[PDB]
């Protein structure tokens, strides 16, 4: 009998689709994470971060959740907070989308908006103040450094990919925001299954901090339009040691690639899915990768 006790338990088992207008003779397959509650890959970590905090007893009846995300992690936490009966406060910099605002209010989130100018620094700041005022009350889950983020990917996303490809996956390409996706997936296939694949992280050309880091060059972040990736620093949840390769992609090409997936494949993907596919396309068209099954994470749906 396959009935989930709440929405949180329904995460994952997302599908593999072969691309027709990218790669070479169907060597690029996409994993659609838009097929999830809250409609993004962050549904996995929203659930496991709450579940682990429960199991270890940092989260109980009585304790509220506070955190600073201005992206899909807010939505993910919102749905899980709702599904499991927790109050949630989210901080974010006021120059956020009414649509995002409205959706979060709908999900029953307490919204604390911070000055536009001051951005995520502002929102993070104000979140820590709020914890600081009542430590026994609020718990912060911290998506950038919480090992329950990559762990879920090791337990679900990675195995799904292995199972659905009958052990044939040769390459995995994934944009990096918190790094959790590529980390967990890589640990699972390399360490748990024992296959030496090529792990490919993707970042905006506008803010190529992983690339500059590994090349021992000056880290120089910048603004970009590829929502979901390009944090402008290395997160703790990115295990550099499992990253075989790093591909950079520009905003315009990531957007266009997105529009192409829509128009040509009938795949409703977000901008970072566009960035991930652009990178994968590039490797798929090198002779060294021609006979290699390449799996790309599509993190979200449109917008």
């Amino acid at each position: 009998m396959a009935i989930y006790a709440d929405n949180s338990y329904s995460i994952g088992n997302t599908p593999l689709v072969r691309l027709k207008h990218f790669g070479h003779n169907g060597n690029v397959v996409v994993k659609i994470e838009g097929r999830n509650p809250s409609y993004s890959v962050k549904c996995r970590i929203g659930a496991n971060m709450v579940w682990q905090a429960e199991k270890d007893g940092t989260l109980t009846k009585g304790k509220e959740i506070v955190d600073a995300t201005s992206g899909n992690t807010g939505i993910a936490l919102a749905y899980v907070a709702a599904a499991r009966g927790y109050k949630l406060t989210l901080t974010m910099p006021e120059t956020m989308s009414l649509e995002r605002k409205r959706l979060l209010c709908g999900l029953g989130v307490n919204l604390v908006l911070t000055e536009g100018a001051k951005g995520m620094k502002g929102a993070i700041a104000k979140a820590e103040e709020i914890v600081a005022s009542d430590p026994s009350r609020y718990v912060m889950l911290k998506q950038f450094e919480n090992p329950a983020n990559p762990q879920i990917h090791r337990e679900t996303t990675g195995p799904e990919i292995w199972k659905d490809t009958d052990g044939k996956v040769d390459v995995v390409v994934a944009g990096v925001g918190t790094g959790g996706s590529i980390t967990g997936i890589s640990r699972a296939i390399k360490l748990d299954f024992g296959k030496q694949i090529t792990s490919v992280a993707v970042e905006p050309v506008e803010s190529p901090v992983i690339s500059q880091t590994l090349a021992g060059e000056e880290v120089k972040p910048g603004p970009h339009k590829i929502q979901g990736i390009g944090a402008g620093f290395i997160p703790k949840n990115l295990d550099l040691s499992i990253i075989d390769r790093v591909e950079t992609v520009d905003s315009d090409t990531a957007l266009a690639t997105a529009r192409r997936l829509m128009a040509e494949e009938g795949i409703l993907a977000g901008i970072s899915s566009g960035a991930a596919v652009a990178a994968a396309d590039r490797l798929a068209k090198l002779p060294e990768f021609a006979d290699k099954l390449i799996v790309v994470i599509l993190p979200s749906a449109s917008e």
Binding site: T69, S70, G71, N72, T73, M92, P93, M96, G119, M120, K121, Q143, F144, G177, T178, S207, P221, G222, P223, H224, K225, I226, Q227, G228, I229, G230, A231, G232, F233, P235
Partner: peptide
């Protein structure tokens, strides 16, 4: 993730 530090 919208900004880690910077998105537009």
């Amino acid at each position: 993730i919208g900004d880690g530090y910077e998105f537009t």
